[PDB]
Structure 1
């Protein structure tokens, strides 16, 4: 094309950036896992949380029990009960970017295969000092940042779940909120006409007596 490049720069400046950023991300993930947190909770907190979860589950699924039991539980919960670390996550990114800019900047790295406008030029050519060069040619720092940004999906794929990248309050308040939310719920039984639904068609006794009765293990 326009410029003639030395193959040595391709062999010795392109790959190391990718290797360094990949392994830096992996190390960041493993270190973040290593010292994630250590939290302890007292008995009252977990007991109250379980009570709140039970009340929420009652409110959500009271439509599968007889109405008398639902209202018996609703008489309860109303009178007696409800009423009685990062520095290593972000700073190493900037530090490594600065170190790479220090020890690698000063030459053309590669070129994107699609045309761009002059708006792209100030971002992709931090190190070079030319004036009329096209915006497709990129510097080393821009390539490093592009490589950093374009690895979230790869990290999510090759590594478990998603990591290695950047992006109750008051018991009485919760008790009052749940008391107010539960007061407007009414029982709606879901078994009123189950028999008629069952009687519509014959039972599905197909594909049940295939194979053979198991004899022993394996």
Structure 2
């Protein structure tokens, strides 16, 4: 094998892991710190909640008798009622959203480049599986060897593997669905599509057969204590 310098472990292997871990934490914390809710007026939240109610009605009107459901239908999408008809109305925001979307991967690539410069010329670890030779130019950046096994990796690709393998850990410790990783606007069209969808929907009162399906079995009663 190869008698690698022990100091390469104490100053090039572990620091990379620590950097990746804390950079992920930093990135997640900066993401949550930067996020500020945009102010919403009454109309937008009102229409969003109205279409929410309409959709949940479409979803589960089955537990509601037919007349209540078709009265709901009349109220929402029907000329006479009026509802769903008389219900309608470098930029800073684009730059901000583009920067926010960019800051999820670009900092990682910049850190990788900085590491590649800072830690150029080493052999950090041997990958325990026989990688292909064609992957040599990128795994062994900063190494002048020619016949070296492809399983030996430079600092940059080791950092890349580290950053690839730590997202699950981030979700494990930081919390579920953390932001440290690598990866309605229009109501008129929404109104019309809700109109069409709830027009297409039908009714099936799920209570039409609850009694018969209840009479079959006795009521659970144990554990009353």
Secondary structure in 1 aligned to 2:146?
coil
The alpha-carbon deviation at position 7 of structure 1 amounts to 1.5
- Computing the radius of gyration from Cα coordinates, the structure with the larger value is 1
Superposed CA offset, 1:85-135 (max 9, x none) = 345433322222222112211121110122232123222101101111111
Distance in 1 (alpha carbons) for counterparts of 2:69 and 2:25: 52
- Does structure 1 retain, via aligned residues, the 8 Å contact 2:170–2:178? yes
Secondary structure in 2 aligned to 1:48?
helix
Following TM superposition, where does structure 1 have runs of at least 4 consecutive aligned residues deviating by more than 4 angstroms? 80-83
- Does structure 1 retain, via aligned residues, the 8 Å contact 2:132–2:150? yes
Superposed CA offset, 1:127-152 (max 9, x none) = 10111111111111111111111111
Secondary structure in 2 aligned to 1:192?
helix
Distance in 2 (alpha carbons) for counterparts of 1:141 and 1:163: 25
Secondary structure in 1 aligned to 2:105?
helix
TM-score, structure 1 length as denominator?
Answer: 0.85
Q: How many residues align?
A: 207
Distance in 1 (alpha carbons) for counterparts of 2:10 and 2:206: 70
- Does structure 1 retain, via aligned residues, the 8 Å contact 2:62–2:204? yes
Distance 1:175 1:194, change over 3 A: same
The alpha-carbon deviation at position 52 of structure 1 amounts to 0.8
Secondary structure in 2 aligned to 1:101?
helix
Identify the range of structure 1 (40-49 vs 177-186) with the bigger mean alpha-carbon deviation.
Answer: 177-186
- Does structure 1 retain, via aligned residues, the 8 Å contact 2:63–2:206? yes
The alpha-carbon deviation at position 157 of structure 1 amounts to 0.4
For 1:78-117, list aligned pairs within 5 A. Answer: 78-79=77-78, 85-117=100-132
Distance 1:58 1:162, change over 3 A: closer
The alpha-carbon deviation at position 164 of structure 1 amounts to 4.5
- Does structure 2 retain, via aligned residues, the 8 Å contact 1:82–1:179? no
TM-score, structure 2 length as denominator?
Answer: 0.83
Distance in 2 (alpha carbons) for counterparts of 1:116 and 1:166: 25
- Does structure 2 retain, via aligned residues, the 8 Å contact 1:104–1:140? yes
Distance in 1 (alpha carbons) for counterparts of 2:188 and 2:80: 11
Secondary structure in 2 aligned to 1:75?
helix
- Unmatched segments (≥5 aa) in structure 1: 209-217
- Unmatched segments (≥5 aa) in structure 2: 83-99
- Does structure 2 retain, via aligned residues, the 8 Å contact 1:26–1:164? no
Distance 1:81 1:51, change over 3 A: farther
